[PDB]
Design a protein around this ligand. Structure first.
Ligand SMILES: O=C(O)[C@@H](O)[C@H](O)[C@H](O)COP(=O)(O)O
Ligand SMILES: O=C(O)[C@@H](O)[C@H](O)[C@H](O)COP(=O)(O)O
Ligand SMILES: Cn1ncc(Br)c1N
Ligand SMILES: Cn1ncc(Br)c1N
Lengths: 551, 551
């Protein structure tokens, strides 16, 4: 399973891209590119067709890229063996080398029931069987047939989990909230901070609340603590532990720990080690989604991911949409030295989409060691950030337009709103902003125009805009379950691409693994009341100041 | 009002800091610094005492800084005239040069009624008079005496506004939600996206809902549109426009536009041009806060800001807490070339604190032109991001620990929880994470330790942690109104400092001003149905694809 090369900087096309950066890239004029190439929009935009014949336009043409540059980036991808690694992923090979695991989120959305084996054994029916369990259970919650311990239908579902066991369910239930039904609400406890439990459960009724304990390992400190506190809250009213079986289910890989916690095995929704947390919403972890919007919508979301998987698998690199996205990220990160990537949904439902992508991206690609087990001498993962528009335009877009940092940005809009109020007035205004913002980042406003518009003397430079600030625009028809499925999978495969070029393992997380063992030593120290002198002086000082100030 | 210098790079200490970066900074060992200096925690931490005798510890000692470096940064601040600009701000001078305005958020929290003049006229009583109006109105909402058009008490208050007229109210009501009362809820419509209106108003009763239309200009497109749609929603039930007077108030500078919209002048809460939006929560814009948690709590929040103002005004630079913070930001941005700054509250109530600071920071300091009206040839504002812990630890902290990017970070914890459930178990665990995370970023884990812990061969590098990754830890006793007031003001004055060194105008926003006129041309084009060919080919293509896909 070893690597075909050591460092990205070893790939012969890397030095050629450095040369191209110097001669064409650094000074690249997007205005000039459009003037030189009447077909530029056609050449640097791609329509994706989803399984339901809906469409998404990916327009890359406002980026600092042309045919020469993209052809060089494609050659780099071939040298890096992006296709070989991708094929190994889809083959169920153990490409997560450091944990010796398969990387098989693609198998979770295999609705076609293709043969998709791990360790030589097809996963298709095992995955499907969990999905059938999810459909049966979510249907029974939604139709009222699953009753709580006093015989009432469930009104509230509380997911308890953190990281990969939280953020997908949050983001996707928010994104697809138009598909929810009145009277059936979802909630998400994740932070160990007791505020999260107290505020979430404050107004809920134990008789009509169902908890889903979401944990791959079922040993995570925060989650098991939160789950215990919720069980205590439930039993304060319900009294008898026999009633737990109607109110607690588990989403997990670890049957022994689930049962040991006192959940019935029948109420476990399983998944496997080859599902990374930040790739897990497609699994049993998405049960809150199926409950909130219905299993059929959840299934449509999976099929959207599957269609984008097939696109990534089958398309030559030069027309492969997630690959192009990933190649542009490498271009900016490693040649321009842009440390960040901005993601801006022009969509209020997608308000937690940037935060989700931040996990996906940064937890996958924030690595310093390659598959050849040497340290990198070049940049890896970027820092991702964002908020929805139009809010963002009034905020940090000031810096995006007039600051000193290059910030590659992705803007996303649906042509149709789920909420086309006031005869679509609000939607037309939203869309006008989408178009005009990316236009303005490209066109800018030169000295002569500032003067024509009435500024004189020392005010003029203050009102200039450089332009040639790059954007990618992604236009969907509508943010349906299927569309969101395809969009997430796009970003998954974009992340894949970047990581393949950098020659890192996109699929481990030894810093978040360390995080889950770090705090125990200090926790024991906070339990007894003596002052501490066992760490560095800052840690000791902070701890001791805390001890003086704590309740 | 002109500048004493052109470019930061002209300041004699700038080149000296470049030299210090090369010889001491680049290779700085924080472990070595603690070993060399037994008093390092004491020397690089400061206790702030608030007006109510509560305290906040600011520990900078895990930063890449020592006495030599900090003394050089202080000298740079003196060369840049940070104190002169600060004194001009507090004097009511028109230091927002490009708009020729005073910068006088500090006057909003002048509870001491010091003489604080703009254009030679004291502002103290005018500010106070608005606050007395806010107290009377918020008291009458809270006590039930302000009734809606059918004679019922108000149960829901909806703020409508965007940017500076939204994010402060959102963040501060979230942060201080422990101080709210059952049955009186606040809501925030901001996005033009009609989803925001539809979802917010779905379950509200027009008879018991009060709107606050928050707009400095009272002409912002999104806000006036949202406000109109809310008025339409209200009148669909209420029928008669005479009932608007019991249900709509305005937070604004622009009395003529407010009345013209059909709000009663008596229900206007005014503020002045010298309040920037991203500095406005202290003004009439904070009315939702006063309603949600009570005017006395709002006033305590102002007094916390006032105390931090007095600290910033009166403290020599070497012990001036916001200045030190700002100097470290310049150090990382301009000498290390770190493009970002991470802010992580170990506090679920403060979940929107990073987003608020993102506006404050990036909208203030994302500028390319100095007070001498020349373009910069060095980096200005950083990109700010963050999410609360412990969630963030499971997410992008992977990259913070093991990626290739330097990411200066601020961690914030309260020693006491408003929600100390389970005999403070959750709070002790939260705090243990706070300490352990910053410890781990500093200490790292070398090759020998990885081997001792059981890794062999090619796995070892994958599990190494560099350490020497910097953090600032801020420990409060409790996040009270007063504490939050002081914390925001800290960041305001930190932002001030950075901008003063860069010699930019922290107080204009010509990119967000452009944003509010950009979209109108395209909006007219989306109104008629013909295809468009009036822009660049990408803009035209996106618009035309939208037209094919739109309802
Ligand atoms: O990305 C990850 O691996 C983490 O965010 C995990 O999802 C998080 O630690 C929760 O782990 P578990 O699902 O085992 O409870
Ligand atoms: O920071 C700013 O200036 C903007 O975010 C404004 O707050 C926003 O545009 C709203 O402007 P107004 O308060 O005039 O409606
Ligand atoms: C660079 N990038 N942008 C979004 C995502 Br997900 C990644 N990895
Ligand atoms: C650098 N920085 N960190 C927080 C804020 Br507010 C700013 N300007």
């Amino acid at each position: 399973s070893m690597a075909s090369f050591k460092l990205a900087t070893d790939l012969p096309e890397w030095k050629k891209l450095e040369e191209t950066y110097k001669s064409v890239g650094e000074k690249f004029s997007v205005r000039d590119a459009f003037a030189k190439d009447p077909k530029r929009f056609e050449e640097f935009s791609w329509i994706y067709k989803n399984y339901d014949d809906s469409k998404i336009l990916f327009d890359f043409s406002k980026n600092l890229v042309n045919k020469e540059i993209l052809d060089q980036l494609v050659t780099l991808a071939k040298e890096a063996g992006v296709e070989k690694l991708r094929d190994a992923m889809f083959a169920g090979d153990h490409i997560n080398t450091t944990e010796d695991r398969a990387v098989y989120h693609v198998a979770l959305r295999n609705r076609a029931l293709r043969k998709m084996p791990v360790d030589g054994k097809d996963t298709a029916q095992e995955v499907d069987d969990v999905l059938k369990h999810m459909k049966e259970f979510s249907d029974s919650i939604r139709d009222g047939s699953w009753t709580g311990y006093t015989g009432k239908s469930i009104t509230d579902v509380v997911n308890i989990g953190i990281g990969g066991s939280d953020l997908g369910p949050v983001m996707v239930t928010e994104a697809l909230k138009a598909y929810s039904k009145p009277g059936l609400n979802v909630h998400f406890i994740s932070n160990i901070d007791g505020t999260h439990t107290a505020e979430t459960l404050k107004n809920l009724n134990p008789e009509t609340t169902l908890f889903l304990i979401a944990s791959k390992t079922f040993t995570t400190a925060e989650t098991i603590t939160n789950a215990t506190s919720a069980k205590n809250w439930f039993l304060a009213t319900a009294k008898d532990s026999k009633h737990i079986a109607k109110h607690f289910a588990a989403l997990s890989t670890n049957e022994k720990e689930v049962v040991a916690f006192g959940i019935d095995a029948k109420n476990m929704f399983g998944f496997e080690s080859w599902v990374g947390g930040r790739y897990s919403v497609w699994s049993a972890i998405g049960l809150s989604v199926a409950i909130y919007i219905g299993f059929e919508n959840f299934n449509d979301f999976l099929k959207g991911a599957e269609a984008m998987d097939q696109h990534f698998l089958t398309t030559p690199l030069e027309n492969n949409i997630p690959v192009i996205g990933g190649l542009l990220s490498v271009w900016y990160n490693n040649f321009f030295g842009a440390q960040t990537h901005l993601v801006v949904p022009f969509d209020q439902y997608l308000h937690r989409f940037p935060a989700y992508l931040q996990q996906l991206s940064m937890e996958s690609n924030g690595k310093s060691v390659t598959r050849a087990n040497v340290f990198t001498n070049y940049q890896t993962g970027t820092i991702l950030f964002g908020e929805p528009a139009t809010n963002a335009q009034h905020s940090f877009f000031q810096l995006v337009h007039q600051g000193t940092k290059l910030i590659p940005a992705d803007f996303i809009l649906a042509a149709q709103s789920h909420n086309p109020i006031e005869k679509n007035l609000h939607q037309r205004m939203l869309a006008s902003n989408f178009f005009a913002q990316s236009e303005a980042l490209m066109v800018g406003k030169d000295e002569a125009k500032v003067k024509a518009e009435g500024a004189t003397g020392g005010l003029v430079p203050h009102k200039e805009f450089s332009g040639n600030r790059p954007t990618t625009s992604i236009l969907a028809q509508k943010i349906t379950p299927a569309t969101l499925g395809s969009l997430i999978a796009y970003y998954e495969h974009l992340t894949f691409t970047e990581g393949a070029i950098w020659n890192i393992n996109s699929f481990d997380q030894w810093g978040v693994e360390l995080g889950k063992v770090l705090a125990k030593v200090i926790g024991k120290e906070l339990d007894d009341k003596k002052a501490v002198a066992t760490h560095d002086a800052s840690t000791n000082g902070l701890i001791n100041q805390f001890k003086e100030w704590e309740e």
